[PDB]
RNA sequence: UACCUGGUUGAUCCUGCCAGUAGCAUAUGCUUGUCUCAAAGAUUAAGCCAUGCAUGUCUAAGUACGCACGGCCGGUACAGUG
């Protein structure tokens, strides 16, 4: 599944502003960036060994 | 600038100190137009303290669901400022 679609959004309705839903930033979520960070760590290991 | 002068005697030459002399550093007195530097609660009490201030700090890069501001109504988690 994809947790991105199951984050509890909270509704905000104030008089002078249009209503909107606020969502938290999902933490500890695996994204392309963290995978690239792991790749870079392993590549640094390889570079050190070489 | 390697300097002395007055004072013991009726007078003299000494010893010798007192006083003078110049700076320096604190205080104080009188006086004080310009201008440049510039010390300043050490001395007595490391005595006592009203009040205020004197140490805080965020980047692209730890944590943002504070509508506190702020958008592009969305399989659009997180726009951004904060």
Curated annotation (Swiss-Prot):
Name the record gives this protein: Small ribosomal subunit protein eS6
Annotated transmembrane regions: none
Extent of the signal sequence: none
Places the protein is found: Cytoplasm; Nucleus, Nucleolus
Purpose: Component of the 40S small ribosomal subunit. Plays an important role in controlling cell growth and proliferation through the selective translation of particular classes of mRNA. Part of the small subunit (SSU) processome, first precursor of the small eukaryotic ribosomal subunit.
Species, as recorded: Homo sapiens
Residues of the full protein shown: 151 to 200 of 249
PTM comment, free text: Ribosomal protein S6 is the major substrate of protein kinases in eukaryote ribosomes. The phosphorylation is stimulated by growth factors, tumor promoting agents, and mitogens. It is dephosphorylated at growth arrest.
Complex formation: Component of the small ribosomal subunit. Part of the small subunit (SSU) processome, composed of more than 70 proteins and the RNA chaperone small nucleolar RNA (snoRNA) U3.
Family: Belongs to the eukaryotic ribosomal protein eS6 family.
Top-level taxon of the source organism: Eukaryota
């Amino acid at each position: 599944d994809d947790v991105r679609q199951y984050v509890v959004r909270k509704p905000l309705n104030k008089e002078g502003k249009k209503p909107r839903t606020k969502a938290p930033k999902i933490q500890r979520l695996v994204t392309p960036r963290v995978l690239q960070h792991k790749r870079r760590r392993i590549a640094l290991k390889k570079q050190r060994t070489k």
